[PDB]
Structure 1
């Protein structure tokens, strides 16, 4: 993991303490800030490290498919993500998009340690360390009636706040350099020739709504379009759609 900003280093320290606990952890941060990477770090630093690490993007599925993907269904079986994570960790991304029906069912799994399994088959007991992520203001949603207060009262045992790249301004150039060098290797340039002051201004003044994912893409495209080691990279191509 790249980064020397104190805000980022404080996250890594927090994660090293939280990881060994079986308690649920909420990660708040923008897209591209490394939320999944942090969830993974929580699993690999925990006592569950040899168990499975399973992920699911709540925003990606309609209500009935999300219900079935998470909790499973009987119509043999399609095991849900809680079952597949048994003895391990389950990372639920974009939590704030989970419908209220899913949120209530999730609280039940957390409070009772089991999944309901219709009739015929006994309820399934599960043993899963939960990590969830979002960029929403969950307390505001609770006020608006779009997120369950009860779920949040129990789910947010602690909160990891990942800083956006624009608040780690020291790390922008560090990471840009790293990504430029890697792209130099990929296209066989002998040396990364540096960033001009204009390029640095462009990099540091942009707000990076896509954070680290967007930085890496921008920098790769920019090295490629530059295409030489003979002189420093001057043109940072933030928006490939205008040219």
Structure 2
């Protein structure tokens, strides 16, 4: 059926249209690639995709390419069945083997392991994976989801990403609007974050947003669509404000050192 979105983190300018197109492609389970700010509107994109994913009971598998090191990443990718692989024992269900029919939520870590990229090109080549020392191959099925944080064509032309790896996947590419480009739900998201912070910290009331504070927030470039804005909101909330001062000298930027 329909899974409700956890957060109403959407931009009025074009995120509604992006969500509409995603729902249009949501029933399809083909190679899906997203794009947006890393950690800001990209994790939200993955969560929304999971909510709008077809059917239910799908194990939402998410991984980061920077982790899993290098030598042991292959065992988790292709799987582990032969001895002396993962402490031997039972056939270790690899990361790809663990997710059968679930969403494989990719992360745009842009891992230099282009060898891992080539191996993943085989991970989704005909829908199968063979465990380490596996006697016979196994045709495993799982949904594929991707998100991007940089220019994939720039990486392919510069060789940071395999050209065949890009060619095989990404039946569609979806770029999330930049935080400096949307600029629609800025006040709405600020108010929602302020309400959530007041609820969490048990603030007696939302202090309120001043025009000078609003002007400074508009001046802020907000590199992080969902994080740096959330960081600024948390910084202003922890800094807090007097009952009279709704947001006078509200501390949006937390990185600044004290005098």
TM-score, normalised by the number of residues in structure 2: 0.85
Measured after TM superposition, the shift of residue 82 of structure 1 is: 1.5
Q: Is the 8 A contact 2:33 2:170 kept in 1?
A: yes
The answer to which of 30-39 and 213-222 deviates more is 30-39
- Once residues 17 and 98 of structure 1 are traced to their aligned partners in structure 2, the CA distance between those partners, rounded to angstroms, is 33
What is the CA distance between 1:48 and its match in structure 2?
4.1
* Runs of 4+ that moved beyond 6 A: none
**How do 1:178-197 residues align onto structure 2 when only pairs under 5 Å count?**
178-197=192-211
Deviation, 1:120, is 4.9
CA-atom RMSD in angstroms: 2.0
Counterparts of 1:230 and 1:189, CA distance in 2:
15
Asked whether the equivalents of residues 240 and 250 of structure 2 are also in contact (C-alpha less than 8 Å), the reply is no
In the TM superposition, residue 3 of structure 1 has moved relative to its aligned partner by 2.5
Gap runs ≥5 in structure 1: none
Q: Secondary structure at the match of 1:112?
A: coil
The C-alpha deviation readout for 1:94-152, integer Å capped at 9, x for no partner, is 25225111111111121221112344532122111111122121111111122111111
- Cα shift at 1:25: 0.8
Q: Secondary structure at the match of 1:58?
A: coil
* TM superposition score normalised by structure 1: 0.90
Secondary structure of the residue aligned to 2:11 is coil
Deviations 1:6-26 (A, max 9, x none): 311111011101211120111
The count of corresponding residues between Structure 1 and Structure 2 is: 241
Give the conservation status (yes or no) of the 8 Å contact 1:189–1:228.
no
Structure having the larger proportion of residues in strand: 1
* Structure having the larger proportion of residues in helix: 1
Structure 2: gaps spanning 5 or more residues? 1-7, 82-89
